């Protein structure tokens, strides 16, 4: 508007006017990201540094003769004899409500090309977790949208749910569907029901980060979701500090009165970046070519996402770390450390994904430590009877090949178990609400879906959901507002499902 280039040139003319206080030390050796800086006696531990060419560094190995600093850029800009400068502060990042809607990096700089970010505060990356007196019980429910996740292993606000799995088996698919299903609560006015997402892409390529941000913007889901871009083409210090920088920005909402949800994708890529910088700093290794603080690096960043009490603000933070396993072995080195520190893990096998289960979620391997305490009262009534029928049908699933020798009790468990597993299979980017999932689970657990065929399970899910929104709209709206089921709601739901099953 009227020469916009003249406004930016006048404000950037006078800025450099107080930079005559020397700097720090020099540089003796550099290579493979390391930088042996000679001097800097006043530099503290884990402090930000700056080279003469413009590359930043983090002094983490403070010795007596030199100081090992890990460069965040390329090693071609630093040479033997370059002057180094100390920032005087620790490794911090920007936080606040102004970061929603832009993709930031590992240091807080915006890379989406939308101008600056209005940061309301500056939090450090290596922050302490919450104590045992400032934490409460997990009572709020986290709506993921999946029918097999909201009934079996239901996650809550403040817990840590791991997303284990093999290669291409439903790892990032469960985290993307849960963040996009919060549009019904974030678009309203209730601040306690909304949950700001925090996708931290670490270890992925450049094409994978651009495809995930374009899909969330088309469905109105990128306006309240932080994106921490951390590709594998940068240094090892930027990828290893991606878990600490994303947890500090999402902690500002839980300390004020809102809810957050971090998705560390992936947990396997963060462990490889921390071991690369420690091996080049002249340190002893351990198991699987890792340092001594391998179990303490992942437990410190996952313990900070907890649910606060009413005296601290009433906020919570969810941590969704995806553990990329090798070939289905859940008892490895990095797989066993993340499952023991989290309060639940969602397994994903590659054999169930090719059969028809979308997504592949094993009910016999995935469990939640919170139980039914962090779920809705309306969905807890149908999830109690379906848990016993799904466990008995899995152990007797070997008798499905011999259908000519089935008894009375064997034929009832096979027909009801097959219809309950096919009804929970949903498509990609198609999450359901709590009112639509309570009506579909009650028709399969009571016995209203045993008369239908196995191939007609896909057509019955869309026919019963569309007819319930035009004929019995009062039953679906009462189950979502109150969140429970009284005596009048049970009699009205059984009469509507029996009249629609005759056609």
């Amino acid at each position: 508007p009227t020469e916009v280039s003249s406004i930016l040139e006048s404000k950037i003319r006078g800025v450099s006017d107080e930079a005559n206080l020397d700097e720090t030390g020099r540089v003796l050796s550099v290579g493979d990201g390391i930088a042996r800086v000679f001097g800097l006696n006043n530099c503290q531990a884990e402090e930000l540094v700056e080279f003469a060419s413009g590359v930043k560094g983090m002094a983490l190995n403070l010795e007596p003769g030199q100081v090992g600093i890990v460069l965040f850029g390329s090693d071609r800009e630093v040479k033997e004899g370059e002057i180094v400068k100390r920032t005087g502060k620790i490794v911090d990042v920007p936080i606040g409500p102004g970061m929603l809607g832009r993709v930031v990096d590992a240091l807080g700089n915006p890379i989406d090309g939308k101008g600056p970010i209005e940061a309301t505060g500056y939090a450090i990356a290596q922050l302490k977790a919450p104590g045992i007196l400032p934490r409460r019980s997990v009572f709020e429910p986290m709506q993921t949208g999946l029918k097999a996740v909201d009934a079996l292993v239901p996650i809550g606000r403040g817990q840590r749910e791991l997303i284990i799995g093999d290669r291409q088996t439903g790892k990032t698919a469960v985290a993307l569907d849960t963040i996009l299903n919060q549009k019904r609560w974030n678009d309203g006015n209730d601040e306690s029901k909304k949950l700001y997402c925090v996708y931290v892409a670490v270890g992925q390529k450049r094409s994978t980060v651009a495809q995930l941000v374009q899909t969330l913007e088309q469905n109105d889901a990128m306006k309240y979701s932080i994106v921490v871009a951390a590709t594998a083409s940068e240094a090892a210090p930027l990828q290893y500090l991606a878990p600490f920088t994303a947890c500090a920005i999402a902690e500002w909402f839980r300390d004020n009165g809102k809810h957050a949800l971090i998705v560390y994708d992936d947990l396997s890529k963060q462990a490889v970046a921390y071991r690369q910088l420690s091996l080049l700093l002249r340190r002893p290794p351990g198991r699987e070519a890792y340092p001594g603080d391998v179990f303490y690096l992942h437990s410190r960043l996952l313990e900070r996402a907890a649910k606060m009490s009413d005296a601290n603000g009433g906020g919570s933070l969810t941590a969704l770390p995806v553990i990329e396993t090798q070939g289905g072995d859940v008892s490895a080195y990095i797989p066993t450390n993340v499952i023991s520190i989290t309060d639940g893990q969602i397994f994903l096998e590659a054999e169930l994904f090719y059969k028809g289960i979308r997504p592949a979620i094993n009910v016999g391997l995935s469990v939640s430590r919170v139980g039914s305490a962090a779920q809705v009262k309306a969905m807890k009534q149908v999830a109690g009877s379906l848990k016993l029928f799904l466990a008995q049908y899995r152990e007797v699933a070997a008798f499905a090949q011999f259908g000519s020798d089935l008894d009375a009790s064997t034929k009832q468990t096979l027909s009801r178990g097959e219809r309950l597993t096919q009804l929970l299979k949903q498509k990609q980017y198609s999450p359901q609400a709590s009112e639509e999932q309570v009506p579909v689970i009650y028709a399969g657990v009571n016995g209203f879906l045993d008369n239908i065929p196995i191939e007609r399970i896909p057509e019955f899910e869309e026919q019963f959901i569309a007819y319930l929104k035009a004929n019995e709209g009062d039953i679906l709206e009462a189950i979502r507002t109150k969140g429970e089921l009284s005596s009048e709601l049970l009699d009205k739901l059984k009469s509507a499902t029996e009249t629609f099953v005759a056609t």
Binding site: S29, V30, D32, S74, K79, R167, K205, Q276, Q401
Partner: protein, 471 residues
């Protein structure tokens, strides 16, 4: 001129420490020239700096003949390579020199091999499918246009034959130019690839060529093998950014880039990682894979081939490259011994273009139905080896016969593998492969035998093979 002259102080293997003056030392990834006894030179890339006016350099050739105190002049920049239209049809090396005995490469500009990758704002997402001609590639994992393709497989499964058959039916009819950059190949594979492209019209010595040849097999040292991927990608990146053309980079193999850096990582002062690898495995692989993407200036369809170590996908060089590829064509050693040419896994291969919004609703149902029938046959085959065929009912008997004919129908005879098979090469289109797979799953070809679909094309070749075998 102010040339930075250095003195050789240490030489053990490929690593050579050069000692220069104070202040005039070269930076990292800088080419260092060295006068030998022949008419060529000894290129050396600076890796790190040990200090005290000395930097450790990695030689890109033979280190035999270097004494303590020789002259080592610095070029000032990195390893320059010839780019443009002059590199098409000639066999370039890792240092940018011709190895085809056809004179020098008359190039107007010379770009460096070491360059930064694209940013997050310059990335351009796409969802276009690329037809290859195979029946198992056009129905299972479809290749994306402008993305990274990885042909995973073991030794002797069919990794080199898969890249040669796809280049004779996609790269020969494309609008852009190709870029065959072989790293860690063999001596006989380099001579056979150049002679086949001249008889088909891809490399014309007296006309026009559209395929860049970059030499660099396993006959050199560890410095030339690790720098072969950066030299070949520099010529393909200039045609898509400055000229704006859909380049096609063919790397064979992609697993040789990670193994070449670990051979000199022990002598450079770095600790070993897992399975005898280097600590910077994820940093070195991500810097070269991110630069071969699709930006706003042009696309780049990378068709690299990954080599699994003794048929193991859980290694550090195979699992780290699966996250930087759209379509992954994993091969198995068990399907190659049964007669499937090639051994294409219908369940292990995955792609991002296998959805209902990119291939359509009709193509999405055929891919899901073929994967469900092949996965269910593995569980039923274990019960027949202990109980027999008496436990199968009417539905289990028909599923076992339909799974055997569907696996042999996807194996078509390639044009480059005519000397080992004997039959002629067949190329099926994308519309013919989807129509033939949907008719066999419904019950229209249940009376035909399993030998009529083995080593055939589409639905037309399966009906002609059944009538000729019965006479």
């Amino acid at each position: 001129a102010g040339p930075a002259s250095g003195k050789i102080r240490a030489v053990i293997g490929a690593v050579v420490d050069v000692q220069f003056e104070q202040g005039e030392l070269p930076a990292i990834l800088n080419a260092l020239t060295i006068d030998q006894g022949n008419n060529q030179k000894l290129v050396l890339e600076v890796a790190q700096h040990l200090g005290e006016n000395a930097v450790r350099a990695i030689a890109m050739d033979g280190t035999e003949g270097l004494v303590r105190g020789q002259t080592v002049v610095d070029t000032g920049a990195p390893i320059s390579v010839p780019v443009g239209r002059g590199t098409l049809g000639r066999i370039i090396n890792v240092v940018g020199e011709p190895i085809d005995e056809r004179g020098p490469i008359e190039c107007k500009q010379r770009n460096p091999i070491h360059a930064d990758p694209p940013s997050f704002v310059e990335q351009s997402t796409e969802a276009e499918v690329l037809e290859t001609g195979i029946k198992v590639v056009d129905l299972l994992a479809p290749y994306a246009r402008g993305g990274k393709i990885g042909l995973f497989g073991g030794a002797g499964v069919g990794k080199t034959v898969f890249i040669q058959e796809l280049i004779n039916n996609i790269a020969k009819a494309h609008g852009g130019f190709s870029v065959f950059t072989g790293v860690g190949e063999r001596t006989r594979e380099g001579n056979d690839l150049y002679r086949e492209m001249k008889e088909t019209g891809v490399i014309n010595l007296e006309g026009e060529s559209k395929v860049a040849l970059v030499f660099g097999q396993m006959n050199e040292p560890p410095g030339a093998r690790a720098r072969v991927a950066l030299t070949g990608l520099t010529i393909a990146e200039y045609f898509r950014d400055e000229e704006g053309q859909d380049v096609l980079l063919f790397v064979d193999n992609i697993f040789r880039f990670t193994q070449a850096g670990s051979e000199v990582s022990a002598l450079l002062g770095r600790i070993p990682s897992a399975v005898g690898y280097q600590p910077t495995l994820a940093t070195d692989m991500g810097l070269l894979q991110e630069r071969i993407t699709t930006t706003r200036k042009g696309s780049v369809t990378s068709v690299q081939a990954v080599y699994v170590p003794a048929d193991d996908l859980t290694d550090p060089a195979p699992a780290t490259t699966f996250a930087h590829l759209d379509a992954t064509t994993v091969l198995s050693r068990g399907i190659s011994e049964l007669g499937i040419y090639p051994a294409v896994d219908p369940l292990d291969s995955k792609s991002r273009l296998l959805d209902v919004s990119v291939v359509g609703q009709e193509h999405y149902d055929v891919a899901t139905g073929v994967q469900q029938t092949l996965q269910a046959y593995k569980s039923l085959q274990d019960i027949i080896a202990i109980l027999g065929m008496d436990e199968l009912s009417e539905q289990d008997k028909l599923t076992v016969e339909r799974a055997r004919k569907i696996q042999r129908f996807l194996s078509q005879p390639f044009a480059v593998a005519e000397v080992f098979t004997g039959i002629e090469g067949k190329l099926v289109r994308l519309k013919d492969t989807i129509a033939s797979f949907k008719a066999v799953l419904e019950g229209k070809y249940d009376h035909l035998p399993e030998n009529a679909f083995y080593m055939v094309g589409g639905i037309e070749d399966v009906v002609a093979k059944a009538e000729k075998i019965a006479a």
